[PDB]
Design a protein around this ligand. Sequence first.
Ligand SMILES: [Mg+2]
Lengths: 286, 452
Amino acid sequence: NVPKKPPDHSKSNLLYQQIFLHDKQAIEKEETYDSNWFPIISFPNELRFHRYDWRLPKQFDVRTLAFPAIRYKEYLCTFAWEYDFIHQLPKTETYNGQESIRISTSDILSGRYDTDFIRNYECQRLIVQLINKAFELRMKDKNVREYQMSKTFAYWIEKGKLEKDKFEKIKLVGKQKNKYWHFGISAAGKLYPSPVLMVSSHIIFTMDGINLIKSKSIQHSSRRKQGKNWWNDKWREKLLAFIRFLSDDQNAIYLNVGSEEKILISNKPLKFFGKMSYVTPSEVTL
Amino acid sequence: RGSMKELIYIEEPSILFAHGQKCTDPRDGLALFGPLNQIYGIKSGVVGTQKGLQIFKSYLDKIQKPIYNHNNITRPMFPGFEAVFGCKWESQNIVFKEITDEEIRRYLFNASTHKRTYDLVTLFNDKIITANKNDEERVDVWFVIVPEEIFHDQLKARLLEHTIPTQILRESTLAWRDFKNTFGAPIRDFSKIEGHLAWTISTAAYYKAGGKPWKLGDIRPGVCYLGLVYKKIEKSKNPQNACCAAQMFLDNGDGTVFKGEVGPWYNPEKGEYHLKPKEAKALLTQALESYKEQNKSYPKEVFIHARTRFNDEEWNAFNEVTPKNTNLVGVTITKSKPLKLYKTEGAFPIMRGNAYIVDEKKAFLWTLGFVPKLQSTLSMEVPNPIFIEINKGEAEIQQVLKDILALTKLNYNACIYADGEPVTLRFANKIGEILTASTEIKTPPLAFKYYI
RNA sequence: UGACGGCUCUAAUCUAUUAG
DNA sequence: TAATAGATTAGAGCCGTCA
Ligand SMILES: [Mg+2]
């Protein structure tokens, strides 16, 4: 009665920190995080520049090569052997192997190597280009359909090819209303923080699962529809399942670049864990 | 665990409110505490149609009464501007100003928008200027109401020349009831946002009326934070046009903005995003003196924040003007690079504040994520961390992210828990947007009550 | 133009790079 | 002078209103 007393709002701080903040803070226990980063466990031991002179036409499309190769100051950037380009263009048989210049992957990746005719940053860029291009040359053999975004080239799985999943009923394809929604990934790789490969998650929509929707307004508008209720597990599983499906072996992903040599991409994402984190299991519905 | 990598954690920064007490949640503590700078009474003015003022007053007498939220845990209650902010805001006191309906029919008749927008703004600007040009009763902040979109920089730039704080209000945000689409649903669909919609406008309106809702309660002295952003405008037909911006905060009072110069750089098509050494050094001396006079103290450290990498020669110009121990750090933030993490066990995303340090310079900061007190994540999707890398200068990496979390709480436009990017850059985006309406516009005021 | 974020869609530009 | 790309950027729409 008669509430006459100095306010002393610092006391209200204590009540604020113990009435509506009961065991609601950021330092409680350990946790582990699965990243979006896929390490490159093995690189090919050799990166070679080929010296195709008057054996490939200047107007030839290098993107049509059977193996991922890039023209660079009348040299060819590819891990493949000099004799793996017979079918694409003949007359290449007049080429001697010793003419090509060979560059080891270890120093070109660690940044140790640097010369007058090529530098580290551009060498890293070319490797970035090669592994990025190698995905296009691999997705044809992995039985998935492509889709060109503004910059990237997303790939998704055709409707009904699998049992809507890869493992553990993880729904990778499905339909909403009269339209079909399909999980899809992207491709990206770079070497500065560590030799690793990026992927990104997009949902690709089709009117029945085959005949794509060309109107980008519908594709983008539908994209926000499906993600508005997706959980954190939903984004985690639909990516882990998708990568696991694309891998041809339980070890990793084989990125064929040479006739026999290739690039290994671990299917297990690079792992993180933190010392202290949140605890809250509360959820009802939405 | 050998190949496992560690995410360091940054303790949540806090802000102190009125009476000197300090709390962490801006809007939650504010009701219990009160604004840092109390303002005695607020009176405003409105320009528009008669139905606009009726809609305007119908909103004002609504927000004074307590308004709750559909998810009160996520968005806490708003008991009222009179109680939360300790001020008084009536409706009949508000200065009423009118625009004739035929005037709208007079100049909206032309379907062309390029000529209309610049001139229709002139009707908005001129009548307000004639209002508070000789009247003894000066109006604090003018609330411009827009009937329909059928504009920001075009209107604010001229009004900027007369040091008048104004807040634009689209008619939909206050009349979403009647405003319906073909299905009858509201255009903005303000079904759940109600309760929080009042929070952000009230904090904005109070800020524009001279009030300061909060300030950083964990700031060391001798440091200043400066945000530089690059903006290109298509209003100039000439391809060689790309502007810049610069912000100051002083971390204890109202912010400061100096353009230095419009700066028609090379800009082969639209821009190059690099200050020339002549302009770069000129702004910095003109920048530090603002801090020197405001705090009557010699600055010690300045954290230049940008979204682009700095070159070498601009830092040499930067480093040749700071005296004695004043060291500059280039903290460039980027939102593009993704490293989306996932919680292995559980459904909630990575909690905010955790950081991943890749080396002594670069780091990934989760300014957005999951905050426990709110029991929700401000990032609707899996949060995208902002790449923070020290472009130039030597400084402790961990100290940089510690203050970036604090700098993300100082957004007075909206009362959100934290911003995805530090307000030294978020406000800079609103800085360069407004001033590019007209090239010759100069003599820019420092106050941040307007300009946004 | 109450804000926020998270998306797609464009758009430059700056770096090797070959043809002018 | 435009192609191919990677890296690095800025606008400009649209959508969601968070367990
Ligand atoms: Mg505002």
